[PDB]
Amino acid sequence: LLGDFFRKSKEKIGKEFKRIVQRIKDFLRNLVPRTES
């Protein structure tokens, strides 16, 4: 059931990957001490 796994894992990323990309986007914001003047 590996072929089925790939299909299952495939969407599993889209769910967490989306939340990740969204979270990381915030990180960069709290990363720089001073934004553009």
UniProtKB/Swiss-Prot annotation:
Spans annotated as Active core: 17-29
Effect of K18R: No impact on antimicrobial activity against M.luteus
Mod. after translation: Resistant to proteolytic degradation in solution, and when bound to both zwitterionic (mimicking mammalian membranes) and negatively charged membranes (mimicking bacterial membranes).
Protein origin, superkingdom: Eukaryota
Tissue distribution: Expressed in granulocytes (at protein level). Expressed by the eccrine apparatus and secreted into sweat on skin (at protein level).
Effect seen on changing I24D: Loss of antimicrobial activity against M.luteus
Coiled coil (UniProt feature): none
Effect of K18H: Reduced antimicrobial activity against M.luteus
Function summary: Antimicrobial peptide that is an integral component of the innate immune system. Binds to bacterial lipopolysaccharides (LPS). Causes membrane permeabilization by forming transmembrane pores (in vitro). Causes lysis of E.coli. Exhibits antimicrobial activity against Gram-negative bacteria such as P.aeruginosa, S.typhimurium, E.aerogenes, E.coli and P.syringae, Gram-positive bacteria such as L.monocytogenes, S.epidermidis, S.pyogenes and S.aureus, as well as vancomycin-resistant enterococci (in vitro).
Subunit structure: Monomer, homodimer or homotrimer (in vitro). Oligomerizes as tetra- or hexamer in solution (in vitro).
Domain statement: Undergoes conformational change in the presence of lipid A, transitioning from a random coil to an alpha-helical structure.
Full protein name: Antibacterial peptide LL-37
Organism: Homo sapiens
The encoding gene: CAMP
